[PDB]
Amino acid sequence: PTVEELYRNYGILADATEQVGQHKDAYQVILDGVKGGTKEKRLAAQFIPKFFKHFPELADSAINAQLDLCEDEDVSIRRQAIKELPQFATGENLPRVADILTQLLQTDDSAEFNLVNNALLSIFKMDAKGTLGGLFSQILQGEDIVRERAIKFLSTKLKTLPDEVLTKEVEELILTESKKVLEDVTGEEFVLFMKILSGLKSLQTVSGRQQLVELVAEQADLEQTFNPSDPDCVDRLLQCTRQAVPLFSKNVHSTRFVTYFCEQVLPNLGTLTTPVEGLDIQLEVLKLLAEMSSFCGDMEKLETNLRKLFDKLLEYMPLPPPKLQFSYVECLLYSFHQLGRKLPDFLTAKLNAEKLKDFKIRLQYFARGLQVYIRQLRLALQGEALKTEENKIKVVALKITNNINVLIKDLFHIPPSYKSTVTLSWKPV
Amino acid sequence: DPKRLYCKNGGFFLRIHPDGRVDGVREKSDPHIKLQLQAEERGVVSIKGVSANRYLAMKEDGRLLASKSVTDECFFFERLESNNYNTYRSRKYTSWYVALKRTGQYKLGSKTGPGQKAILFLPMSA
């Protein structure tokens, strides 16, 4: 088999018009081109897929001939063959091509890597369910390198497909298969699958986001009792809970998470260990609780959780006889301002007259040192110099102190009010 | 002979803490991965943490803990597989296997089954 015979048999199959299926001998010469050298194989990678549609009786031999070219030592031969693989995904051959293409994602040649992604997206437009089966079966059973590339494929290339391809049943199948994977994913893998699932059109609804919230709830294992001593137990709960924040709306509640933080995390906040430099593990817990408290519904043990939240607030609001942690107070005072609406009797009861008397004294003493630090910040801030790392701290510090001052005045109404609305400092406009 | 249980899923060694935690760690020389496999009846073994003086167990909801005393939940069916990897199936809850996840935690027994990468453990020397 030489380049002369391959070109001549190419013309036999090309000039055959509609009498192509009878020249099976000419197509066999092309199939034998894989046994030739470099120039012979570079032509076989083009001619085998071009006339594959005219010889179903040679399907297995043709797909095998192209697969040998996909595993050739020369990368230029593989690139010529991988590009034409979607031509073979006709009929019962697509799940086999999907398995080969998913296997080929582990290549480290940037040119070959792009051709594998384009071929995967090509058969995806052909048979979406068939290609997903070839991808997820490798995520569930293949090597770690294949599972890694295949997850990244869904994480980055699903957004490039037309909406005509991602039908309702395709999004149903992805959720069905993803829940099979989520029973054994790492911390980073779970972050990728949450981006994949939340990107689906049918899961962006109110009912769809509630299903995603339940997925991270079972992933967080909220029935597991909280252990404050383990450093990885906290970093896993925080990372798993951060994936639930973008899904919370006024009808997609965070009650299961706020209940867990108030019951088991707040009473043990002092025992929190951090193994990473420059990371305040306790403030990050309070930051996360402050974001979720805006979407909490009717709680299981509302009064007990409200007291645990109120007790932790008084630890950072001292009686008038020290440094004031405004960052800690902003998170705790906001969360109590959110959850306190559900039980105004926590302050406006005749039994709680001592708690309300003591609380308004702490709010008044805190406001004295707060308003001193407010104008002290605005004195040092009197568009380019504001972008310095030393001045940006005073900008967010002014947002922290202003939010605290707005919440204190809202609570120091003789009937304590809860109608003020603030934007958390670490949240953009 | 004391052994280490090397899990095929991720490569974790089965670890038993003195407080009763069961998980996996990749460090070869962790003091709490030294295990002693006591033979009970034919085909059933018990796993004891040497440095922890606790026995591996699986309770009602497929969670793995380490009790200080041998209980009903401390016996497991040991089946030899390929290759030199073994599976440990709870004798009381006969459908749940001892398993470690990719994250290193124990896998809930209610989510374990035959033919999983998480249930295969390799006895190692030292």
Author numbering:
A (entry chain A): 2 to 322, 336 to 396, 400 to 446
B (entry chain B): 161 to 286
Please give the exact wording used by the authors of the publication that reports this structure.
Apoptosis inhibitor 5 (API5, also called AAC-11 or FIF) is a nuclear protein that inhibits apoptosis in human cells. The crystal structure of API5 suggests that it functions as a protein-protein interaction mediator with HEAT (at the N-terminal half) and ARM-like (at the C-terminal half) repeat protein binding modules. By integrating structural, proteomic, and functional studies, we unexpectedly found that API5 and FGF2 function in mRNA export in mammalian cells by directly interacting with UAP56 (ATP-dependent RNA helicase), an essential component of various mRNA export machineries, and thereby regulate the expression of several specific oncogenes.
The obtained structure revealed that FGF2 binds to the central region of the API5 helical repeat and provided a detailed picture of the protein-protein interaction interface. The major interaction force between the interface is the multiple electrostatic interactions when the surface charge distribution of the interface areas and salt-dependent decrease of the API5–FGF2 interaction are considered. Twenty residues in API5 and 14 residues in FGF2 directly participate in protein-protein interactions. Among these, seven highly conserved mainly negatively charged residues in API5 (Asp145 in the α8−α9 loop, Glu184/Asp185 in the α10−α11 loop, Glu190 in α11, Glu219 in α12, Asp222 in the α12−α13 loop and Arg237 in α13) form hydrogen bonds or salt bridges with FGF2. Seven positively charged residues on the surface of FGF2 (Asn169 in the β1−β2 loop, Arg223 in β7, Arg262/Thr263 in the β10−β11 loop; Lys 267 in β11; and Lys271 and Lys277 in the β11−β12 loop) form hydrogen bonds or salt bridges with API5. Taken together, the interacting residues can be divided into segments of highly conserved basic (FGF2) or acidic (API5) regions (FGF2-segment 1, 261KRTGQYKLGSKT272; API5-segment 1, 142QGEDIVR148; API5-segment 2, 183LEDVTGEEF191; and API5-segment 3, 219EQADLEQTFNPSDPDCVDR237). The API5-interacting region of FGF2 largely overlaps with the heparin-binding region of FGF2, and the FGFR1-binding region of FGF2 is located on the opposite side of FGF2.
